[PDB]
Design a protein around this ligand. Sequence first.
Ligand SMILES: [Ca+2]
Ligand SMILES: [Mg+2]
Ligand code: NA
Length: 432
Amino acid sequence: YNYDEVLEKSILFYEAERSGDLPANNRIPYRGDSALGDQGNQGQDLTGGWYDAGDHVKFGFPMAFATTTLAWGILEFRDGYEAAGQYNLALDSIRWTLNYFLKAHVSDNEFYGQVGDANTDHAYWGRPEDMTMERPAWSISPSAPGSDLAAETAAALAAGYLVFRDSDAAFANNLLAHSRTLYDFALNNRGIYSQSISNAAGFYASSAYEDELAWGAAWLYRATEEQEYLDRAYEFGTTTNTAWAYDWNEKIVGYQLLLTTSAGQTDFLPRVENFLRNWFPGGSVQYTPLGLAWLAQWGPNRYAANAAFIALVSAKYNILASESEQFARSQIHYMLGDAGRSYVVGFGNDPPQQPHHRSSSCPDQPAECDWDEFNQPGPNYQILYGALVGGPDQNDQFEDLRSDYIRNEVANDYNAGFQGAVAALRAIQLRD
Ligand SMILES: [Ca+2]
Ligand SMILES: [Mg+2]
Ligand code: NA
């Protein structure tokens, strides 16, 4: 497989998800300015960010986690991005959301975590450029805590500091300053963000915030090397529990691996190895007949690509390296087409033609776009290059229907581990 092309197109997927005032060098011809009125309750500019999935909600929690995971991959697999000619583009990709998080952090202890009412937004089918419904904005604050959202955003900002400090120190230092402030806010104003922003509970409900507190502390320790953050990571982290998955809700194996590798903390390595072995063949995750590690019906490709990412970071630091690389490659290659068709839109053999995605479902301007474009039986008019779809059922079956909001879903977090894993595989081609 051409990993250079996969990385190029994955980054184009994120570019097709951009909200706001698009740059002059916009590479997605069917996308234009949209949601230029997104703003806080005192008129604070909230334009930008990524639309989460095939909708037009800006969901802060997965948006931040996708950014942390993308930044981690850029840090560890820079050589793969560079060999692919995609490193500057990858930095530009996450600069978009990092700038959004800076806007959303309107004061020390207030952070906007959602723009768009998901119920109103999902009732609409059409271009984001054509939206006319009200787009409410909700924040977390001392009266409305969200330790999970605040600490995940602090993690993304600290990871972003590390990514950018060697090319744009003014930007990087601003990210780190806000990381510190948001993490203090997360620690000192405790609660679940999707209880405080109740519109989020139907879509990205957080089950617990302690793992985010450990994760944000681990990233801030990598960024600052200040002992107080390593202490926070041990305080809220576990050495005794193994993660079920790595995803936008569960940070456990993420911070365990980060602390093992970047911080040299041996106490967490047994749980990293438990996670890896659970996902490897012979472990505790069922494999489809054709070889996809299949955790659940909701975004199996996302779960498997996330585990592949964790495995490839592990391999880089000589943690079960040979088995990790072989497992990770098997999962990414399933998604690139090993089972007979690609699960990456616009890539490879017989890629999915009907991603559950509004803007790519619309014909070129000035044609009409409404629920007719949801229902129509043919391919989406625009090719959503790079999007990893949710994936097949447990028997490798996939109908490629836009109405299949489970299997044909696309999302920011679906591509986040995937993209870093592809960059890791490209880097291994350099090593070998
Ligand atoms: Ca959590
Ligand atoms: Mg077109
Ligand atoms: Na403009």
